[PDB]
DNA sequence: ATCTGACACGTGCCTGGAGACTAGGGAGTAATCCCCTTGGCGGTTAAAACGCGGGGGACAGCGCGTACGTGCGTTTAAGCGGTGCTAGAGCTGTCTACGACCAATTGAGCGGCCTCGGCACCGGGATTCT
DNA sequence: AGAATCCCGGTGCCGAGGCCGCTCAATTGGTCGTAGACAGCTCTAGCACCGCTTAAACGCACGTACGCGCTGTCCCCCGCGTTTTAACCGCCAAGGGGATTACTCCCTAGTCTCCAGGCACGTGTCAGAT
């Protein structure tokens, strides 16, 4: 639609709750450093979902790109994939 | 407990000297230190591979000036420059 | 005229940029130019960042410079986007873009 | 627990960047490029922390392990 | 056509010339150094040759990555300069 | 003249190197385009390291540091 | 064996790397294992871009390696593709690379 | 006049590792440069942890963490195991 | 199969590298207060989860015209070779000026309090696309 | 015409601006030694003017590969309405482990001194381009 468009567009906020990314994040750091836990300071998990959301915001918006070149509205998945591999990454 | 060095206050008096009204918040004082440590970093990484490769090992106005001469876009280098060299002119017209 | 940078017209701390410039591995020997030359270019940065965040201040009726503004003066003006193209601002959102072929 | 950045919050992280239309396949897809940049970003976290002889990951260390990729972060003390 | 892709992609040789190579690079840096010509070392223009090359070479193939995501098979200019949008 | 002057089949041939079927007619005004900005980059990098040197013969490795630092860099020059 | 070379059992010099290390002004104190470390992973990554280099040199036959071969052996891993993903190395040709649906 | 070098180096490794070919100087030229940029990351990378923990020496432990995180996957954890041996070796006389 | 030439290899020497020992301070190791981060129970609810109708768009098709590869004379400047030059790269020799460095001195700038107002939020008028 | 969406007033509340006591690093003054800034000599190679060759750019004929605008089939996201559920605030409790100081062994800068590793010259012989 095009009210959430601009209301997501005015919003400052952060747009994946909090509580399934920090569970994300520690699992995933639970696979590194050789099988023992850590802890994470308080804004360290804030740090790391201001550059993912950040970055899947640009992701999104370049495969966006991509598909109004490529004659579409939607957004089918190889806009993601081909586009990821274009940046050079 | 540990003094820390930030740049909060001069940012702030900076503010106050630009336009005469407006205040900042936290969260922007936080982003200007940053910012004035991220490209204090770049100039002063610029200065050192300078006077590294040009075989010398002393790092002066020259050189600072070629460092921000390279780093900014097209006219922001052209004004910096002119801005430092002024405030050099002066401090050196004082000493 | 007790300090050096109310000496050379600035308002930063060229003293703690001198220190800087030699505590943190720079090179050998810093000359008296540098650090005031390198305060004299952050002063303005500084200074023309914030006179664009405060001309978007005052145009969204408000008296603070909150993050949202710091991204859209580093994000609505050229130069600056080409200096900043790469960093992510914190608590900033996005300037508002909508492509032509969506539209109605 | 991948699963649990839900559907909807992937689509208004869709929908701040300009985006109409979402297809499908593309939730398993937006997961899959999320696990790789969280993957990368805690790697390079890790290292820092578990040199320097520490627990706690500071957001310190995580604005360092931005800065090295060139996408930094500002905000947070770098 | 298939037999050239193949004799240039197996060549490792430089594919502009020296000398129009020459003639437009003084001629840009003409336009800097407040007028006063310099002298180009001469290799020089080969490293900046084979730089300009290489970002030709690579800006040429993501672009036409775009248009076989496209569905065509030429090589437009819009996708010239999307292929540069995109990358930064 | 001289910017019209690199041939039109070597910017063929550049592009039959990367693999592509077919070349529009308009691609070579735009590609001219691509190319006189990178160079005009490459060459005010240059040309400032040069100029900071007192050196006013350009040599190769302030090109090489040039590509260096924007970050396309190059080997075989003494990087 | 009195040059650390041969007493570190290795093959790069670590004099001038510990020459490099002092006089490049990384930091001050630089201690006796960080040099002699560092030459040991710069003779690991050359000994093991020259296998590759020198196997595709061999496959191609040619007795020597010149330029392509190394930028063969470097395009054709992965690991080393991603240390590797910005250079561009001189006189060095490209991967050959044509899709299947453009023809 | 002198001018220093890493060409005779790159020999020796070369016909350690395989005893026939040899290299046309291009080549030497070329990883001569690959040879001085990864020495240029690893030490400036050396050099930025030992900045950001306040400490002064570049040492073993530091150089074994900036190797890595430099390098990718396998690359990292073999370049580690042979650096360790060679402290080992060296560091036992 | 052969030549055109450059990669491989041999002696002088010479600048940088190794050895032996000094001298100061840096980072290891322990120790104590305490910040704050994990962990777990009420309770409110905002938002996630989901079934189905409905049109919006993805996709195959197709025929029309349009612009691009390729053949073939035909010209145009690139390239190599002489070959002569002189600009400016590079080395080097003093020599002053400027930046490390030390020792005391003093505000500058920082932690902490603390009271104060800008905006978050709520609530009400009013205006008006599609 | 149904929510949509802009001024304006009211109420509250938590961050900001500002004052205030205070360590500590930033200035001032003086010593000094070495690094870079000019003269001055060499002398390598970047420029350039012309000649001769010839590989490549080029202009068009033209045939057809193929871009693309309009056509219909079908499926598949979006929105709506009920369900349900796990985040979130708030409280509480408690125990790592951060941080910061006190001590001190040893680990590296530094300096004299001897010596050989490596580079810079020449000289050959076969590696590859057609």
Same mark, same amino acid.
């Given at each position: 639609? *095009?009210?959430?468009?601009?209301?997501?567009?005015?919003?400052?906020?952060?747009?994946?709750?909090?509580?399934?990314?920090?569970? !994300?994040?520690?699992?995933?750091?639970?696979?590194?450093?050789?099988?023992?836990?850590?802890?994470?300071?308080?804004?360290?998990?804030?740090?790391?979902?201001?550059?993912?959301? =950040?970055?899947?915001?640009?992701?999104?918006?370049?495969?966006?790109?991509?598909?109004?070149?490529? %004659?579409?509205?939607?957004?089918?998945?190889?806009?993601?994939?081909?586009?990821?591999?274009?940046?050079?990454? | 407990?540990?003094?820390?060095?930030?740049?909060?206050?001069?940012?702030?008096?900076?503010?106050?000297?630009?336009?005469?009204?407006?205040?900042?918040?936290?969260?922007?004082?936080?982003?200007?230190?940053?910012?004035?440590?991220?490209?204090?970093?770049?100039?002063?990484?610029?200065?050192?591979?300078?006077?590294?490769?040009?075989?010398?090992?002393?790092?002066?106005?020259?050189?600072?000036?070629?460092?921000?001469?390279?780093?900014?876009?097209?006219?922001?280098? +052209?004004?910096?420059?002119?801005?430092?060299?002024?405030?050099?002119?002066?401090?050196?017209?004082?000493? | 005229?007790?300090?050096?940078?109310?000496?050379?017209? !600035?308002?930063?701390?060229?003293?703690?940029?001198?220190? *800087?410039?030699?505590?943190?591995?720079?090179?050998?020997?810093?000359?008296?130019?540098?650090?005031?030359?390198?305060?004299?270019?952050?002063?303005?940065?500084?200074?023309?960042?914030?006179?664009?965040?405060?001309?978007?201040?005052?145009?969204?009726?408000?008296?603070?410079?909150?993050?949202?503004?710091?991204?859209?003066?580093?994000?609505?003006?050229?130069?600056?986007? +080409?200096?900043?193209?790469?960093?992510?601002?914190?608590? %900033?959102?996005?300037?508002?873009?909508?492509?032509?072929?969506? *539209?109605? | 627990?991948?699963?649990?950045?839900?559907?909807? =919050?992937?689509?208004? !992280?869709?929908?701040?960047?300009?985006?109409?239309?979402?297809?499908?396949?593309?939730?398993?897809?937006?997961?899959?490029?999320?696990?790789?940049? !969280?993957?990368?970003?805690?790697?390079?976290?890790?290292?820092?922390?578990?040199?320097? +002889?520490?627990?706690?990951?500071?957001?310190?260390?995580?604005?360092?392990?931005?800065?090295?990729?060139?996408?930094?972060?500002?905000?947070?003390?770098?």
């Amino acid at each position: 639609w *095009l009210k959430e468009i601009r209301k997501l567009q005015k919003s400052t906020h952060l747009l994946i709750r909090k509580l399934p990314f920090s569970r !994300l994040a520690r699992e995933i750091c639970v696979k590194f450093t050789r099988g023992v836990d850590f802890n994470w300071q308080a804004q360290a998990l804030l740090a790391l979902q201001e550059a993912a959301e =950040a970055f899947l915001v640009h992701l999104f918006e370049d495969a966006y790109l991509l598909t109004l070149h490529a %004659g579409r509205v939607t957004l089918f998945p190889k806009d993601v994939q081909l586009a990821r591999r274009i940046r050079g990454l | 407990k540990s003094r820390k060095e930030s740049y909060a206050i001069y940012v702030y008096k900076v503010l106050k000297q630009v336009h005469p009204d407006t205040g900042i918040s936290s969260k922007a004082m936080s982003i200007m230190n940053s910012f004035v440590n991220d490209v204090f970093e770049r100039i002063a990484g610029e200065a050192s591979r300078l006077a590294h490769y040009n075989k010398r090992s002393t790092i002066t106005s020259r050189e600072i000036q070629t460092a921000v001469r390279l780093l900014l876009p097209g006219e922001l280098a +052209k004004h910096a420059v002119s801005e430092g060299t002024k405030a050099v002119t002066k401090y050196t017209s004082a000493k | 005229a007790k300090t050096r940078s109310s000496r050379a017209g !600035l308002q930063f701390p060229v003293g703690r940029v001198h220190r *800087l410039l030699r505590k943190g591995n720079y090179a050998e020997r810093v000359g008296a130019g540098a650090p005031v030359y390198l305060a004299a270019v952050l002063e303005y940065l500084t200074a023309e960042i914030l006179e664009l965040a405060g001309n978007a201040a005052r145009d969204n009726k408000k008296t603070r410079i909150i993050p949202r503004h710091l991204q859209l003066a580093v994000r609505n003006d050229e130069e600056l986007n +080409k200096l900043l193209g790469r960093v992510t601002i914190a608590q %900033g959102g996005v300037l508002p873009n909508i492509q032509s072929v969506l *539209l109605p | 627990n991948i699963q649990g950045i839900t559907k909807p =919050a992937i689509r208004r !992280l869709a929908r701040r960047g300009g985006v109409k239309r979402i297809s499908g396949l593309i939730y398993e897809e937006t997961r899959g490029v999320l696990k790789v940049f !969280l993957e990368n970003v805690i790697r390079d976290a890790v290292t820092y922390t578990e040199h320097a +002889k520490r627990k706690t990951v500071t957001a310190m260390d995580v604005v360092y392990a931005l800065k090295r990729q060139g996408r930094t972060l500002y905000g947070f003390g770098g």
